[PDB]
Design a protein around this ligand. Sequence first.
Ligand SMILES: COC(=O)[C@@]1(O)C[C@H]2O[C@]1(C)n1c3ccccc3c3c4c(c5c6ccccc6n2c5c31)C(=O)NC4
Ligand SMILES: [Ca+2]
Ligand SMILES: [Mg+2]
Ligand code: NA
Length: 314
Amino acid sequence: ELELDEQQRKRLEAFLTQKQKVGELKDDDFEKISELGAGNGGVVFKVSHKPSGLVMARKLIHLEIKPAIRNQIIRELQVLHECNSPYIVGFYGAFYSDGEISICMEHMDGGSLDQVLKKAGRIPEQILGKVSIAVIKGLTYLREKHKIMHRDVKPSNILVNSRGEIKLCDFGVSGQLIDSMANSFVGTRSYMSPERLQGTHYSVQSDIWSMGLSLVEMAVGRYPIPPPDAKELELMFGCPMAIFELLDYIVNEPPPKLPSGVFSLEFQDFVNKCLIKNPAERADLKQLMVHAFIKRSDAEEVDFAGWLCSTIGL
Ligand SMILES: COC(=O)[C@@]1(O)C[C@H]2O[C@]1(C)n1c3ccccc3c3c4c(c5c6ccccc6n2c5c31)C(=O)NC4
Ligand SMILES: [Ca+2]
Ligand SMILES: [Mg+2]
Ligand code: NA
């Protein structure tokens, strides 16, 4: 299912063309255009690579560690240079400098589905059908060609742009970086599968669960954990807990689910097969790739770009 499209394949080569001319990334070649978002561990800025004129997203993570340690990280990130999927943010290059490690990539003017949600309030099903295909497709490539998991699926990790592109970002690739980052830098797991919340079996199934949870929140408009009362259900459509509480409520409670009537049965059944606790029972990639929801959505002609640009102003 990793086949390529004409327009897509043409866009994949474009990046390559540019990436070639850019050359070695140097700290003094960048110019801060603005801040994009606070990503746990470091910060993301909208920079300008003066020498090339290109606009990029520079991730900065301050890690005062031994040189060999740093030179090590940069060695691991060199892997992202091989990732070529229209469902994953284009990588430009990484490097260290004066205390910080820089991760330069492709800028996504659409932002994260996290912000998009806030703007829209709640994403339409037909739209969520495009995201599913994207995320679903992304994970496959991450495993198919790159034999690695994502390990961190959430609305904030789903970047989109004015071209109607949906790509994933924030997937671990450097063990050392994670090690050094694990220091003070630490994020939540409220989007993680229960299986992992027990040091048990964890594969793409863990990502598939993450997605399922995200899709619901985007569809409903809020975090679907725990299950919102009926007062809101009839409010939002017509019709708190501690980081450790949810972490367990997620393990000792019935998985969330999309409210009936408002959504399509196929979609409802789709998420459900995603939020199946037992990673063994939960649907696998190819299983979802051929799920009625994905087939119906893959066929639907949805102008994602238009709706997005209209939902955020763009
Ligand atoms: C709260 O926001 C986040 O966690 C983001 O994923 C979302 C936010 O910053 C983060 C840290 N982020 C990241 C966290 C980790 C890797 C990449 C990003 C990231 C990228 C971009 C943007 C972005 C663009 C426009 C508005 C906000 C944006 N962000 C990113 C990127 C981008 O255009 N290209 C990569
Ligand atoms: Ca400098
Ligand atoms: Mg993260
Ligand atoms: Na600098």
